[PDB]
Amino acid sequence: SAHLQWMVVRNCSSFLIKRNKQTYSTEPNNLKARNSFRYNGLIHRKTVGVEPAADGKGVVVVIKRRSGQRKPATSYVRTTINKNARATLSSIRHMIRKNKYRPDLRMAAIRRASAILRSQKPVMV
């Protein structure tokens, strides 16, 4: 159960970073990096994540399925997107809103997706 697990790890985790007047959670499948019940990526049955691709270009989205809850080896389906930004977030937006897959991190994803894509394009001197 998410809630029971959240009480366990709300203040005791290896991913917890409590620094000056700040808290940050470093679990791999979390958006906004903030320690919160809503955004934690470990305790929820259905979770979403936005990571940079293995190569520099493109982004990767990770979705947790519903059957293999107890089996992390196949509890995440990862796919990569390497198209234009406007196409990406619109494509991303369809993963959450259209599929009703936790329509609360919808913007946290696209906001994170917008950030990572803007990171990969080269800096200007």
Partner: protein
């Protein structure tokens, strides 16, 4: 498109009451009971690419900033400066003689023409007398003396809005790195239109000041303070 039909005797209160205006507005007889575009269809542009491309304006944003700022509340006031109410001091009337207190022409006596739409005062000294051209002044930084000359029935050209007197800027055409500083535009150019307009206004006001004796010398003078008099005792 009728007029207000409710004369105002004090700001916020009309002359008449609710019932009085109901009769005045004739509301008794006129009682009424009751009773695009986002996208555009562009052509196909084939061949065999059939299906007209339904293009939509205001395409979705290509990037979102990491956070943003929540919108402000509503104010119901705070109208922009363009539509502010222009208040002019009572002593300031078209034709009075003012004294500039702040700028390069500090202490100079000039005549006051009409007041601009911004509230700025458009005045000119009789440039032959004090070298003060048609130039805006602020009513809070001048002193309105008790001397007035009849500048009624003089034709101030209508094309003298604040935009006309607005300062012009040139920097910078296709230069960002600053290594060749511009040696031009430092000499501000007195445009011919300003020259002829200044002649046009001065040609008709100069006869009006020469009527009253020793007023040109009065305007040729510059106001000053002595170790004697004090402004709080002076009558201007």
């Amino acid at each position: 498109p009728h007029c207000s039909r409710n004369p105002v005797l004090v700001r916020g209160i009309g002359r008449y009451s609710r019932s009085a205006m109901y009769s005045r507005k004739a509301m008794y007889k006129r009682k009424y009971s009751a009773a695009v575009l986002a996208t555009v269809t562009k052509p196909v542009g084939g061949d065999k690419n059939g299906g007209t491309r339904v293009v939509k304006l205001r395409k979705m944003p290509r990037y979102y900033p990491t956070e943003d700022v929540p919108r402000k509340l509503l104010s119901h006031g705070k109208k922009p400066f363009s539509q502010h109410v222009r208040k002019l001091r009572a002593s300031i009337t078209p034709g009075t003689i003012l004294i500039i207190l702040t700028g390069r022409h500090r202490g100079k006596r000039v005549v006051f023409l009409k007041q601009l739409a911004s509230g700025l005062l458009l005045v000119t000294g009789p440039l032959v007398l004090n070298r003060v051209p048609l130039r805006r002044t602020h009513q809070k930084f001048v002193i309105a003396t008790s001397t007035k000359i009849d500048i009624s029935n003089v034709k101030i050209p209508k094309h003298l809005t604040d935009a006309y007197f607005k300062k012009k800027k040139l920097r910078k055409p296709r230069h960002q790195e600053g290594e060749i500083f511009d040696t031009e535009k430092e000499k501000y150019e007195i445009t011919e239109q300003r020259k002829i307009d200044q002649k046009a206004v001065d040609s008709q006001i100069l006869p009006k000041i020469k009527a009253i004796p020793q007023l040109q010398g009065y305007l040729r003078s510059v106001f000053a303070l002595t170790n004697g008099i004090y402004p709080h005792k002076l009558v201007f």
